[PDB]
Enzyme design. Structure first.
Site: not given
Ligand SMILES: *[C@@H]1O[C@H](CO)[C@@H](O)[C@H](O)[C@H]1NC(C)=O
Ligand SMILES: *[C@@H]1O[C@H](CO)[C@@H](O)[C@H](O)[C@H]1NC(C)=O
Ligand SMILES: *[C@@H]1O[C@H](CO)[C@@H](O)[C@H](O)[C@H]1NC(C)=O
Ligand SMILES: [Mg+2]
Lengths: 651, 695, 321, 281
Positions: B212, B287, B511, B629, B457
């Site tokens: 614009s 615009t 673990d 696990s 483990h």
């Protein structure tokens, strides 16, 4: 002739140690005894609910206090959780000595006790006395054992709303003995008084609760207080004292309020129905934040004639004063009610709870009275006139007149002398002049031909201090000195704490060291034996001026005049590592509340000590069994034993 | 002519057409100050009209309310360079930056401070500084409404609702001043991350530029430059993307189409963009943003017709829209209506929200408003889409570093498929199977192209890793592809029999094990690593600022007292758990004192269950089996997967495809090694693989 | 005729607002090793704070300290008290009161910061002019019609003259309840689980014509344990299917009537168990249009005469534009 | 200068009351009651008020007898400072025995309204308080357009989000606003109300206190700020206040006049250019 004595508190609390006293008598010098003591089940079965504890005595050591333990697991397994009807347990001492010496049919001698699961001290305080609906509420509980030491036992809190229905429940462990927790009041909650209860997990009856009020309101800016000129109104037909009030209202931050006061009078009875005076309403402009109004003679007389009420019938009713001060030009409204004004026939009140009953003939009668100003602080220097009429011992009754002023805090101890073979004693205690307070009591006499008597004399009538040694005098009356010693025990918080023997002498004395934990009321119980007939007397001693075992001091640096937003150097002082709990409360909460809730202070904690006391009156009794029952113990000597107490209240 | 007494104190001024009537005067003040009035009007030779002029200092919003906490110092409105500290009461864990120094742009730094106890179903959204919130309930389905204070304008979501997935709908509101602006350095990471999610199939990108009269020829030239670098970058990622160029005015003119196959070639798009000129826009200098959005709507409905209603080729088409506008929509109606049409027509919802992102980059200093950019741009949690830059120089600056993604580092993670028809491995590509010499089976999670994280483990026979095998997902076969192991690193603190002298037969402390594979894993739809939190990778996956810390990732991922999570079963299905934190953790882990086989001599619960363990298994929660696990315990946030733990041990094994619970002593209970307590060990053995955040 | 001072006042930027008004503070628990100092920041409220204190130690038992009175005073402040109940679209009159405790005359301009959702007088930008005599107070009235339907932060400001630089500002968040008044709809159902017909019971959904949109629909169940009910409420809801199970008896009897918050849109179901004569009361709350000036008292004030405005409050043509 | 008040009280229930009553009226912002008049009131035998207290903007009266009929009394006050802002005051009456049985009334200025003027329709209201519409007149006065005053008002400040040329069908009065139901000749500009078109009805409302007049049967150009009332029918209903441009469209004879040909023609040039092209910015 030989005997074995069993002493224990009349009520046994689970999960806490029980103290059991054991005593021998007429035992040969070289003879010794052996055995064990434990509880059992109340005839339902014969499993021992307590681990056995041994006790070995001889002639030279014929007394011992046993710290018997009653774990919860054994109590549950043996069956205290499975009885029928009332809670009761049996405590028994087992020894081969009864069969060997007295040739008794059984080696079992025991007492009947009532078992109760209440234990430990639980205190809790909320965030504020009063909350708005829909507002968050914070609170915390503290878990302490018998000695107020911090305890890690698990507890379960609960919350009950205004109608009384449960809203919450939390089962929480105690790593630090303090459990903080918050919950939100429902928005639609009507005004009421909520309640928060906390119990030990295994203690069913150990519920301690506090209450906070919920009400729709907004924070007031100032409070109004109506202070009567005198908190009593004399209604004697001869004259009526003037009635004057000092209505004060101050902004909470200190300055007085400029405005007007609207005062409405009326008569409010005991039930609560208030009948206002139509007319005689007083409206005044506040000057210097105070308004001094009064009720005239003719005006009040005319008000009662309008209500068709006479002066003579004005007994027990109250002069109700209500004030509704409008701040001007603020326009704010605040209301203050007066309901403490009492129409009385005497400006003093006599409290005769402390005067011991069933006193021994041949020893001084200790008449103790509390001259308290009616709805006020204790009075001092107020003379007391007392007439004692010793009833016919075989001759004409005699009048004994003693006068003595109150030494302080309303305490008066008048030691009238009682002659022997007195049938019964009549007393008339009158205090105050003019318009005295009249209190009359009558005391009987122990049955004649008794095996003997024991008198406890307390030379110092003033209450002992903390850490202050107290000494008493004991004198056997009315029997020969066949016995060689007498035995005494001290009871505090319902448990036998001290046991000792003193040899018989002339003008003897026994010294008891008043420890802190014995406060605020401990029983002194003493007895000797005239042949095989026990005679006992138990004096109740109250300790005042209670203070913490440690100390906690709050202080603010400098003068208490600050401006909003600046820093405060609050000071914390104590004598050990303590989980100090703090709290800052706006004062307006107190004013907005309909009923002013007093904050937690040492009065309530010291009453928490007294909640575990099994005492029944100021002590004394005609017989040893009655004395022991009033003190709160169970006595069995193998032939005559006291029955288990009917109720904990002991009316 | 107009009077010349228009000096501002401490600043300068400029004029458009001298002192002639109708000229516009622009006031400028140095940074940390704002012009007041911003601009003046010369009138019809009258007095200098205003919508004395002084560069009043920048003053910055102050906390209207700070629930469940306190803030020091307390001021009406903090000045520039000021600091504020946010520490709150006990039982409440802080989130965001405790110390916020307010920048000269009118914004604070760091995430807004708020502490939540976690009892609510959703995290505490908090009160942004300068804003207020209505409704203090965080239950599922409840709503909060935000309102600005004083003269601030609200950018963000004026209304947020706690959704089922534990994330509030919409972005976090931020009350802003009309004169506040954004720094390029602040907003570059936000744009980069948001576009990274748009890239996370084929993507459709629309670029909208302003031409614009208000935007100058040089300003439009810089807009063209920024668009060209942006397009250059988006094609350098080798992603299936098509870009369209629209330059709008009072009437919109389309310069490139996505219907045309030409949009997928870089030379053609840059040539088309360079052929843009301001001259072909003088025929109407308005615009009309609604017109450009309607042009995009027509574009996509033509794509809809040509592709098809239900075809897969369109369903995987994602849309991102960029607008380099000065925010002065003055014709054609409200631009929000066309965005409404777009949302209605793509069938956008809580799930297909990822397929539509709107970026509203405002540029300018005197006619820029906040409402249009905020409304026009999209609103998503943890991201910002509405921006303003004072100058186009700043636009080029932010764009040229907008995709600063580190070169060749790669290591993407946490990308999965959430369709039920997808295979189990494709849904969880990190999941691997571990075969030690004991012939028993364990699970694991890919954390990179070479390293696997599992439980220690699982290897009871010893440390001979040469006889161990692993199986990762593989597209060519459901059996997976077997790899050998170059080296194994078991946590040195691990010893199942460390506490046997106290009557505890098995202790699972430390673990944790890290396994390095012999050959690098080929990334595919069956094999991708999971994002290990507390690194740059997970930070980019979490839509968070650059300066995030590890404690921050704890506070965000493990953000509730009960946080839902997941683990992979033996058959590959995804099971549901809930992690219990804070106060509830203690009650969760207290049921170990009633075990009868593992601990016959147990007097202290903390001795077997430490702070190293997460706790789960109440309610109807699933209980992992021994074979499961070592598998990852993962949570899903923002369509990515993050491993907060992995299975260690449990108090009841349902596998002793088949499963069975019971209702007697002991109740099922499970514990997983919380990865956040092992940070030093992963940093020791993984620092040269992932880039870990400051602790 | 009356002299007015304009823009010779305080700049309104330096005046420190007061926003923190907690009814309670300092709720923390501290571990004191025989000595500790606390640097506590005073809240802006102008009252006296009674600082409680309790002690719990492993060796010295328990001690409760004497409360410490602490006073905060400013000597000139704009004390404002928001109404207890404000309803959306309902007109209220905020009453900021200015207390002047100095020994001097003070002239102060009082205004309310214009904020979205509040309909003030003249748009909210106009400042009311008042003078407070020394040692006295003056109230100023602001009329507001709130249409925000949500909590909103207003900031009333007093600005003294530059000759006497005094002033105060207060910013309390004003919560506005949603339109209309509240209505309670209690439904009572006796509960006899012994009778098989009462084992299941269906509560009709709520279809209230006068229920207001955004009614803040809250349902609370009130079930009485007076005789062991296992009453479980399962309900399909727009938010979701949530079921809360209530075990009132808990194998125990000490006042265990229960009440739980239970959140539903429309429909609710009951599953019964146990053996008792309990009572269930589901409580529904929602907004409603209803009315009630008193029916007993009435008041009406009529004013006649000429009042002078400050040339910024005359709603008329400028006559030259 | 001096203003005469009138405070009036009465009761209707006759049962729920407990007798006496308390009057609490608050004067305007810049008024304090005259003590001489109040004391003259209280000195009469049938004073109707047994007590009073007056300081500044707060006046207290104690009514000891509230009857069924309208019996009341007025007093005079004076002005210290001009009323800073137009607004109604409040007068409250408390019950002597049960103050919680209170209920207030809002009384306006001598000429103004009782309650804050706000435009409520459907379930929303817009704050109608503000400034009078100007009713700009340039062509009829003969003043030539300078710097495009209408375009400048449209595009710079206050930026206009709705603009129509409307032919006023009717004039009516509803509540505190005078409604001018109108028909849309053309739609120059629009932000909200996407369904705007010619030959469509729209309600334009202005506060009755103002003197703005929209003669029926004539066309006006209307521009200004958008409102959120929705007219309860579906069409957005606009309010006329400040920041709103009102101009009378040229007629068959006033634009014919000599000093008016340039002005009217310039206005139609604006009409066409702004409806067709736009703000051009
Ligand atoms: C404990 O609960 C009982 C039963 O409701 C009640 O009577 C008693 O007062 C409570 N004890 C307290 C409050 O100390
Ligand atoms: C304040 O105003 C009062 C009332 O008009 C006046 O008497 C007094 O002199 C003034 N000044 C002071 C310092 O009090
Ligand atoms: C209520 O539910 C519990 C769940 O444990 C069950 O054991 C009990 O039998 C039920 N109550 C009754 C009175 O049957
Ligand atoms: Mg433009």
């Amino acid at each position: 002739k030989p005997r074995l004595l069993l002493f224990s508190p009349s009520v046994v609390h689970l999960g806490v140690p029980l103290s059991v006293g054991v005593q021998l008598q007429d035992v040969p010098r070289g003879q010794v005894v052996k055995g064990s003591v434990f509880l059992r089940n109340p005839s339902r079965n014969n499993v021992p609910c307590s681990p056995k504890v041994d006790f070995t005595l001889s002639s030279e050591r014929d007394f011992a206090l046993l710290s018997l333990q009653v774990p919860l697991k054994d109590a549950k397994s043996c069956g205290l959780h499975q009885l029928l009807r009332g809670p009761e347990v049996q405590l028994v001492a087992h020894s081969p000595w009864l069969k060997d010496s007295l040739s008794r049919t059984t080696n079992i001698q025991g007492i009947n006790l009532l078992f109760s699961s209440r234990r430990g001290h639980l205190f809790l305080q909320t965030d504020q006395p009063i909350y708005n609906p829909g507002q968050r509420v914070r609170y915390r509980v503290f878990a302490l054992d018998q000695k107020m030491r911090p305890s890690t036992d698990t507890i379960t809190v609960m919350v009950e709303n205004s109608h009384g229905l449960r809203v919450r429940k939390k089962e929480v462990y105690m790593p630090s003995s303090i459990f903080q927790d918050d919950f939100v009041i429902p928005d639609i909650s009507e005004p009421g008084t909520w309640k928060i209860s906390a119990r030990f997990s295994d203690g069913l009856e150990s519920n301690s609760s506090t209450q906070f009020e919920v009400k729709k309101y907004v924070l007031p800016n100032f409070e109004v207080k109506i202070t009567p000129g005198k908190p009593y109104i004399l209604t004697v037909p001869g004259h009526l004292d003037e009635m004057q009030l000092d209505i004060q209202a101050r902004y909470i931050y200190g300055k007085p309020v400029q405005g007007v006061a609207y005062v409405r009078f009326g008569l409010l009875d005991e039930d609560g129905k208030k009948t206002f005076f139509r007319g005689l309403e007083s409206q005044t402009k506040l000057v210097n934040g105070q308004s001094h109004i009064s009720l005239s003679k003719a005006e009040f007389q005319d008000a009662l004639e309008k209500l068709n009420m006479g002066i003579t019938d004005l007994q027990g009713l109250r002069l109700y004063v209500a004030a509704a001060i409008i701040e001007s030009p603020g326009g704010e409204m605040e209301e203050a009610e007066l309901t403490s004004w009492y129409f009385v026939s005497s400006p003093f009140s006599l409290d005769l709870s402390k005067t011991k009953r069933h006193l021994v003939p041949g020893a001084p009668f200790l008449l103790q009275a509390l001259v308290r100003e009616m709805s006020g602080s204790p009075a001092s220097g107020i003379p007391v006139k007392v007439s004692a009429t010793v009833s016919s011992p075989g001759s004409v009754p005699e009048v004994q007149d003693i006068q003595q002023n109150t030494d302080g805090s309303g305490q008066v101890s008048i030691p009238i002398i009682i002659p022997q073979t007195i049938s019964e004693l009549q007393l008339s205690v009158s205090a105050g002049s003019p318009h005295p307070a009249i209190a009359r009591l009558t005391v009987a006499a122990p049955p004649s031909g008794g095996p003997g008597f024991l008198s406890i004399e307390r030379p110092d009538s003033r209450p002992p201090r903390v850490g202050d040694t107290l000494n008493l005098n004991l004198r056997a009356v009315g029997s020969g000195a066949t016995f060689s010693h007498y035995y005494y025990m001290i009871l505090s918080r319902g448990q036998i704490v001290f046991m000792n023997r003193e040899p018989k002498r002339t003008l003897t004395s026994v010294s008891v060291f008043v420890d802190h934990h014995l406060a605020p009321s401990f029983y002194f119980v003493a007895f000797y034996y005239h042949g095989d007939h026990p005679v006992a007397n138990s004096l109740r001693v109250d300790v005042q001026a209670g203070a913490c075992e440690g100390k906690l001091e709050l202080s603010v640096d400098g003068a208490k005049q600050y401006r909003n937003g600046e820093s405060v150097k609050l000071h914390l002082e104590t004598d050990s590592l303590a989980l100090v709990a703090l709290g800052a409360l706006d004062t307006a909460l107190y004013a907005a509340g309909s009923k002013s809730h007093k904050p937690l202070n040492m009065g309530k904690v010291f009453e928490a000590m007294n909640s575990y006391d099994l005492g029944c009156g100021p002590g004394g009794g005609d017989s040893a069994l009655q004395v022991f029952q009033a003190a709160g113990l169970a006595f069995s000597d193998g032939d005559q034993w006291t029955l288990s107490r009917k109720r904990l209240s002991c009316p | 002519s107009c009077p010349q007494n228009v000096n501002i104190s401490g600043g300068t001024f400029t004029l458009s057409h001298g002192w002639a009537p109708g000229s516009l005067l622009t006031y400028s003040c140095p940074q940390g100050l704002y012009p007041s009035p911003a601009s003046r009007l010369c009138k019809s030779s009258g007095q200098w009209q205003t919508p004395k002029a002084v560069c009043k200092p920048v003053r910055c919003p102050a906390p209207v309310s700070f629930e469940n906490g306190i803030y020091t110092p307390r001021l009406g409105s903090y000045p520039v360079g000021g600091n504020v500290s946010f520490e709150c009461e006990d039982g409440f864990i802080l989130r965001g930056s405790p110390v916020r120094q307010c920048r000269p742009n009118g914004m604070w730094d760091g995430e807004t401070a708020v502490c939540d106890n976690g009892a609510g179903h959703c995290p505490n959204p908090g009160i942004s500084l300068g804003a207020v919130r209505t409704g203090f309930r965080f239950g599922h389905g409840d709503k909060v409404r935000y309102r600005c204070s004083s003269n601030l304008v609200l950018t963000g979501s004026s209304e947020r609702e706690c959704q089922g997935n534990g994330v509030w709908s919409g972005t976090e509101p931020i009350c802003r001043q009309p004169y506040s602006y954004d720094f390029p350095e602040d907003v570059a990471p936000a744009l980069g991350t948001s576009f990274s999610h748009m890239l996370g199939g084929h993507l459709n990108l629309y670029l909208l530029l302003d031409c614009s009269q208000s935007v100058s020829e040089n300003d439009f030239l810089i807009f063209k430059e920024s668009a060209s670098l942006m397009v250059d970058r988006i094609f350098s990622f080798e992603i299936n993307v098509s870009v369209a160029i629209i330059t709008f005015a009072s009437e919109p003119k389309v310069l490139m189409s996505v219907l045309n196959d030409n949009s997928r070639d870089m030379t053609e798009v840059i040539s088309s963009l360079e052929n843009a000129n301001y001259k072909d826009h003088e025929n109407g200098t308005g615009t009309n943003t609604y017109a450009a959005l309607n042009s995009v709507y027509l574009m996509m409905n033509n794509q809809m017709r040509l592709l098809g209603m239900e075809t897969m080729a369109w369903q995987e088409i994602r849309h991102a829209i960029i607008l380099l506008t000065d925010g002065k929509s003055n014709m054609g109606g409200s631009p929000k209506t066309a965005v409404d049409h777009i949302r209605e027509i793509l069938n956008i919802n809580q799930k297909r929200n990822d397929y539509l992102d709107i970026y509203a980059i405002g540029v300018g200093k005197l006619d820029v408003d906040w409402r249009e950019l905020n409304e026009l741009g999209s609103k998503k949690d943890g991201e910002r889409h509405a921006f303003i830059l004072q100058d186009t120089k700043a636009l080029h600056q932010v764009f040229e570093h907008m995709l600063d993604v580190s070169k060749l580092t790669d290591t993407i993670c946490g990308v999965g498929n959430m369709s039920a028809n997808a295979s189990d491995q494709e849904r969880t590509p990190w999941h691997v199977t571990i075969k030690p010499k004991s012939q028993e089976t364990c699970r694991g999670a890919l954390i990179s192209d070479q390293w696997v994280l599992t439980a220690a483990h699982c290897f009871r026979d010893g440390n001979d890793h040469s006889l161990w095998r692993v199986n990762v997902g593989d597209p060519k076969s459901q059996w997976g592809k077997e790899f050998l192991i170059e080296k194994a690193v078991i946590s040195p603190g691990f010893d199942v029999f460390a506490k046997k002298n106290q009557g505890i037969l098995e202790f699972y402390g430390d673990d944790i094990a890290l396994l390095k594979l012999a050959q690098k894993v080929k990334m595919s739809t069956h094999a991708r690593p999971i994002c290990l939190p507390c690194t740059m990778e997970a930070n980019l996956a979490l839509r968070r600022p650059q300066g995030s810390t590890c404690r921050d990732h704890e506070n965000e991922l493990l953000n509730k007292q009960s946080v839902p999570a997941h683990f992979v079963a033996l058959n590959g299905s995804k099971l549901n758990i809930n992690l219990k934190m804070g106060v509830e953790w203690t009650s969760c882990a207290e049921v170990v004192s009633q075990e009868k086989t593992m601990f016959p001599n147990l007097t202290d619960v903390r001795e077997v269950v430490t702070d190293q363990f997460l706790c789960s298994g109440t309610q109807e929660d699933e209980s992992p089996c021994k074979g499961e696990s070592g598998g990852a315990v993962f949570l899903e946030r923002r369509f990515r997967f993050f491993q907060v733990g992995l299975v260690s041990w449990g108090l009841y094994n349902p596998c002793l495809r088949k499963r069975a619970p019971r209702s007697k002593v002991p109740p099922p209970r499970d514990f997983h090694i919380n990865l956040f307590r092992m940070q030093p060990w992963l940093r020791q053995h993984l620092g040269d693989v992932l880039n870990f955040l400051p602790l």
